[PDB]
Enzyme design. Structure first.
Site, mmCIF file in Angstrom:
data_model
loop_
_atom_site.group_PDB
_atom_site.id
_atom_site.type_symbol
_atom_site.label_atom_id
_atom_site.label_comp_id
_atom_site.label_asym_id
_atom_site.label_seq_id
_atom_site.Cartn_x
_atom_site.Cartn_y
_atom_site.Cartn_z
ATOM 1 N N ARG B 230 0.996 -0.992 0.202
ATOM 2 C CA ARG B 230 -0.601 -0.141 -0.259
ATOM 3 C C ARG B 230 1.025 1.328 0.136
ATOM 4 O O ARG B 230 1.796 1.224 0.472
ATOM 5 C CB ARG B 230 -0.662 0.052 1.299
ATOM 6 N N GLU B 259 -2.606 7.502 -5.053
ATOM 7 C CA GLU B 259 -2.970 6.749 -6.363
ATOM 8 C C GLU B 259 -4.721 7.918 -6.657
ATOM 9 O O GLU B 259 -5.180 7.996 -5.818
ATOM 10 C CB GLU B 259 -3.025 5.980 -6.865
ATOM 11 N N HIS B 277 -0.934 0.382 -9.764
ATOM 12 C CA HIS B 277 -1.931 -0.769 -8.965
ATOM 13 C C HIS B 277 -2.079 -1.615 -9.772
ATOM 14 O O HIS B 277 -3.806 -2.754 -9.902
ATOM 15 C CB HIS B 277 -2.799 -0.144 -8.362
#
Ligand code: NAP
Ligand code: NAP
EC number: 1.1.1.237
Lengths: 311, 311
Positions: B230, B259, B277
């Site tokens: 993360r 993000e 991601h």
């Protein structure tokens, strides 16, 4: 000093190590090469080559005091071995010490193509993430990996791939005993049974264009070609066209039929990854390779058994 | 029909599968969300979230008929588990079925950064190969791999890395028995003993910025950070600065603190790889994940044991 002719700029460290033990000659920095040759023939007793420039008939003939060709490479297709034997010339190479890195590259290429790692990084860098998600890609783990030439580098690739749960298949002229990989007796049958096809065999007239349109047809629109062998192993124009048209799933290429020329039509494809022949290109490995070339030269010039002789 | 609120556009297939069994609501396509909520609260009995949008206190409170949050993700940090328990809400996730792909990504990132696979492909595509060789890079095989959080994905990474002859080290709050990896009791000591440092732990306030300047200092100018956990696990501004200045060797990043915003200063660095991601982003895996979310929803609404419950 013994005259050592280095064919092209392959290693600053190797240049250094050669220059402190011999008379190093830098072939690539002579405008009129043939004359140079004629002019320093009496001194040149060793040639150091690599996968771009070795020692062909014509060079060997212009080097009548030549005693040894020590290649800064495992591949030997740039060296005329027959001519070498007729003129009394030893030949050495650098096997095994680059195995790790070339097989790591093949795995790096598989991932970079299946997971579009290169296209993803470009997507990000041009701010496109702000407008949405990258597209879905392809899972590597569990895929069928076919290897042409289950040798030092082919085995190294196979064992890496196993750790990703890949079923392993291979084609060699002969089956490696005690291996539970699937042997296939033809490259075409192998390609039909592979999601990913890795080229890891030497280059000879017998493996030239071993990747042809038939094989490419067998690999197919979902199939991925990994070439870490030699450019001429593939019929490049048929490779380019199958990729442009979508008839081959994708490709990770370290070597090209006419390097460093790379067909520019490849430059717009997002289902390919293109590297300038870097299979062995790490500080760690080029060092050891360079010490090996030196070692063979120092063994030859001091009457000892060579380290990695081929001829 | 049972009202199912999907928080953001995570899967066309999932949209399809949800829409044929329930009343699918597309949260992301409502301009005035709070009102929408108020307006469809009486119908919404399920929430489907993911790693971008889960179910926080405030949403759960606006959804007083909420019975279950089924996350299209293994991570749960976007779901308020405490609030969920106070209001009677089940929570499920998607563990294991994405393990393979996220760990393949971590290996892909290692190779892409150490072997500059992305920089090589760009070099080629702009015709630079004609003027010379790409630079030498770094060998992956044999390097020290440190893993923060030796869990499902961390173990999967570790076992892949072993096949490249990497010594494996790890930090977890507890040592996994019967493993011959090196346990270290602190992330900082781990980073000092690693060439490559992989983040594979969940996000909590306790692991927030677990990668800090101290750790970054410990990793160093030759050290490489792999973040597949993360974004907030790293103090991004200190990560960006160590990379800009050369105080950290390099980095492969799948996730960012904010993000899809990625600090643009990263965009000019050649010692980083940046992905939007995509750890789980394959056709194969997103399919199974989607069927799992469905499965949990269909178990819940039919009084059966849930499949992958967390709350
Ligand atoms: N990307 C780069 O930087 C890079 C670097 C190093 C090497 N290479 C290439 O890699 C090659 C392989 O190196 P290596 O060290 O692994 O050598 P290797 O150990 O000799 O292995 C070669 C293998 O190829 C197979 N083979 C030979 N002739 C064949 C044929 N006609 N048809 C099918 N298979 C054949 C052999 O099996 P059988 O005998 O049973 O048929 C063997 O498994 C080199 O020759 C070179 O061209 C590329
Ligand atoms: N890139 C992406 O697409 C992507 C995809 C999926 C998941 N992820 C991330 O990956 C994470 C891991 O998933 P997983 O499935 O592998 O879960 P997991 O099995 O729970 O593994 C997590 C691990 O982290 C360790 N851990 C937990 N708390 C810790 C703490 N405070 N300090 C240090 N270590 C701690 C655990 O060990 P101990 O208990 O001993 O400390 C355990 O080894 C998810 O939570 C998610 O955030 C990212």
């Amino acid at each position: 000093a013994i005259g050592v002719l280095m064919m092209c700029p392959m290693s600053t460290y190797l240049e250094q190590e050669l220059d402190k033990r011999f008379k190093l000659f830098r072939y690539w920095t002579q405008p009129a090469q043939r004359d140079f040759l004629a002019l320093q023939a009496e001194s040149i007793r060793a040639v150091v080559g690599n996968s771009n420039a070795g020692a062909d008939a014509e060079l060997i003939d212009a080097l009548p005091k030549l005693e040894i060709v020590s290649s800064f490479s495992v591949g030997l297709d740039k060296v005329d071995l027959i001519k070498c034997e007729e003129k009394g010339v030893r030949v050495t190479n650098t096997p095994d010490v680059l195995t790790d890195d070339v097989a790591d590259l093949a795995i790096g290429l598989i991932l970079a193509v299946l997971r579009r790692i290169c296209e993803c990084d470009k997507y990000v860098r041009r701010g496109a993430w702000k407008f949405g998600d990258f597209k879905l890609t392809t899972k590597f783990s569990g895929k069928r990996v076919g290897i042409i030439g289950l040798g030092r580098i082919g085995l190294a690739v196979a064992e890496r791939a196993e750790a990703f749960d890949c079923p392993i298949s291979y084609f060699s002229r002969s089956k490696k005993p005690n291996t539970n990989y699937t042997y296939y007796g033809s490259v075409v049958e192998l390609a039909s049974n592979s999601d990913i096809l890795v080229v890891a065999c030497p280059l000879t007239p017998e493996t030239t264009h071993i990747i042809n349109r038939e094989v490419i047809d067998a690999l197919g629109p979902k199939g991925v070609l990994i070439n870490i062998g030699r450019g001429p192993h593939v019929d490049e124009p048929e490779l380019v066209s199958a990729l442009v048209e979508g008839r081959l799933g994708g490709a990770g290429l370290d070597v090209f039929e006419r390097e460093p020329e790379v067909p520019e039509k490849l430059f717009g494809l997002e289902n390919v990854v293109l590297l300038p022949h870097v299979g062995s290109g790490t500080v760690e490995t080029r060092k050891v390779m360079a010490d090996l070339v030196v070692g063979n030269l120092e063994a030859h010039f001091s009457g000892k058994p060579l380290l990695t002789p081929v001829v």
